[PDB]
């Protein structure tokens, strides 16, 4: 969905607007932290 794809694009602002509150926002942030610059 758009949430998943916005994580993969590394745009953390979009976690809030495109992901459901709770685990899907957490998962968006954790993906970014795991695999986006400057975390990697």
Swiss-Prot record:
Signal recorded as keyword: yes
Gene Ontology cellular component annotations, sorted alphabetically: extracellular region; plasma membrane
Keywords associated with the record: Cell membrane, Disulfide bond, Membrane, Pheromone, Secreted, Signal
GO-annotated molecular function: pheromone activity
Disulfide links within the chain: 3-19, 10-36, 15-28
Protein's UniProt keywords contain Aminoacyl-tRNA synthetase: no
Cited function: Mating ciliate pheromones (or gamones) are diffusible extracellular communication signals that distinguish different intraspecific classes of cells commonly referred to as 'mating types'. They prepare the latter for conjugation by changing their cell surface properties. The membrane-bound form promotes inter-cellular communication and adhesion for mating pair formation and may act as binding site for the secreted form.
Self-association state and partner proteins as the record states: Homodimer.
Protein name (database record): Mating pheromone Er-1/Er-3
Organism field: Euplotes raikovi
